[PDB]
Amino acid sequence: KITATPSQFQPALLNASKWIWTGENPIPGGSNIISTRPFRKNITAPCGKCSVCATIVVASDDAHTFYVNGVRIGTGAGFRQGQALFVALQPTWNLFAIAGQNLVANSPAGIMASILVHFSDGTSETFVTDESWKTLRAAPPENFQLPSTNDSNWPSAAVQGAYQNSVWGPPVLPPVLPLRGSNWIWTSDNVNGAAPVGSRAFRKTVNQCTKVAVCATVLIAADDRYTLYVNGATVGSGSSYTVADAYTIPNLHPTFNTFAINATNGGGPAGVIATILITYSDGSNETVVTDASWKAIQTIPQGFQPPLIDEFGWESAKIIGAFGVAPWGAGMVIPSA
Ligand SMILES: *[C@@H]1O[C@H](CO)[C@@H](O[C@@H]2O[C@H](CO)[C@@H](O)[C@H](O)[C@H]2NC(C)=O)[C@H](O)[C@H]1NC(C)=O
Ligand SMILES: *[C@@H]1O[C@H](CO)[C@@H](O[C@@H]2O[C@H](CO)[C@@H](O)[C@H](O)[C@H]2NC(C)=O)[C@H](O)[C@H]1NC(C)=O
Ligand SMILES: *[C@@H]1O[C@H](CO)[C@@H](O[C@H]2O[C@H](CO)[C@@H](O)[C@H](O)[C@H]2NC(C)=O)[C@H](O)[C@H]1NC(C)=O
Ligand SMILES: CC(=O)N[C@@H]1[C@@H](O)[C@@H](O)[C@@H](CO)O[C@H]1O
Ligand SMILES: [Ca+2]
Ligand SMILES: [Ca+2]
């Protein structure tokens, strides 16, 4: 039962996290052979809380594959900048599994992750890579990542370093979501680099009726200002085209969700841009971006935000340009994952 409601996005940080490997070299940050190694941690929800979903940041020397409850969530590489991943969880326990690879001979090896778990009651807790994870001093077995594998006789992971004290130094958090990939959109009265003064509304429905949607993360900005709605409820508003806002929607409807925006032009150029990631209970996700599949209208009707209104006389939104175009450029300040 989910009493959490939409909120400002809360970043997962690496500050409390540790680098782990096998300890085949007992020197932390020491030379390691070219190898692939498994890591697993079964994490349980505290007393009378349900886990709903997680924000994950993972970094690796040299590369990783990340699994949750046996499902591949992502693949990445590199220790200078973390990789953001989002995943729906089982309510009481979750098996996290990572395959790490050292790709350069005589070089250090390590995995670091932070898992920020959101609970049904609106609280959060961060879990990290540390010596409580299990590993093997050998290539991962077939199906090492499945919950049905017994890791009772596996050794403990060896700590290679901490966030602020390691051969790697502190990895930079990635942006919560990319804007690269999204489009500034408006109504088709936006012509020759300017649009009229006024408010315009935009709508996007997601409806995968054979899946169960769990959480959304939304990244949004507008020239000049916006208010954002999900299934008719207020998520938030902003007034900056240089600093983007991020939100968590921890209580999605399971099959049908409507995002609606009232965006206002104070003068000159205008646009709204957003990226939305939706997590599903099977471990999959989908990304939605501002594009021409959104609907837009120039005079905002009463109830423009309700999920099931008649969209008759809404137009296809106009693409003003991909993220990066003048006048706004590529410099948007995006919150950290
Ligand atoms: C959402 O899930 C997808 C599918 O499981 C992940 O990716 C595909 O996944 C990899 C791993 O990062 C991407 O690099 C690929 O590019 C995708 N397929 C392609 C290009 O052919 C993705 O990591 C997930 N996003 C999350 C969990 O945040
Ligand atoms: C992760 O730990 C949980 C909690 O300890 C395990 O689930 C318990 O598993 C026992 C043994 O099957 C069950 O009989 C209990 O009913 C479960 N407790 C709860 C709170 O669900 C779980 O099996 C572990 N998962 C893996 C992959 O090892
Ligand atoms: C869309 O958003 C705009 C901007 O928030 C809303 O605008 C105005 O709302 C009131 C009139 O109802 C004024 O007293 C406000 O001061 C005014 N603010 C601005 C910046 O214009 C607009 O009403 C919104 N809602 C709809 C449904 O349009
Ligand atoms: C008064 C006016 O037009 N201000 C606009 C501002 O809203 C924004 O659109 C900016 C984009 O670069 O151009 C500015 O000149
Ligand atoms: Ca290495
Ligand atoms: Ca403007």
For residue 284, which ligand has an atom nearest its CA? 1
Q: Which of 261, 264, 297 gets mutated to test ligand 3 (max ligand atoms within 8 A of its CB)?
A: 264
- Region of 201 please: left (phi>0), alpha (psi -120 to 50) or beta: beta
Q: Please name the method used to determine this structure.
A: X-ray
Q: Is 257 helix (H, G, I), strand (E, B) or coil?
A: strand
List the one residue out of 209, 201, 208, 251 whose CA is nearest residue 231.
251
Ligand 3 and 199: CB distance under 6 A: yes
Distance CA 300, CA 17 (A): 47
Question: Is the peptide bond preceding residue 327 cis, with omega within 30 degrees of 0?
Answer: yes
Distance CA 130, CA 114 (A): 10
- Indicate the residue type of 169: G
* Residue that has been written with the tokens 């936006």 in this structure: 190
List the one residue out of 172, 187, 178 whose CA is nearest residue 318.
187
Terminal CA-CA length for the chain: 26
Beta 183-186 vs 110-119: how paired, if at all?
A: unpaired
- Copy the structure tokens of residue 185: 């959109």
In the chain, DSSP finds a helix count (H) and a strand count (E) of 0, 22
List the one residue out of 50, 178, 175, 27 whose CA is nearest residue 107.
27
| Distance between Cα 112 and ligand 4 center (Å) | 43
CA-95 nearest atom, ligand 2: 27
265 is in an annotated binding site: yes
282 is in an annotated binding site: no
How many alpha carbons fall within 13 Å on the CB side of residue 291? 11
Decide if 265 contacts 300 (C-beta within 8 A).
no
For residue 267, with 0-12 CB atoms within 10 Å meaning exposed, 13-18 middle and 19 or more buried, which class applies?
A: exposed
Q: What is the resolution of this structure in A?
A: 2.1
Element (H, E) at 315: strand 315-316
Ligand 4 and 271: CB distance under 6 A: no
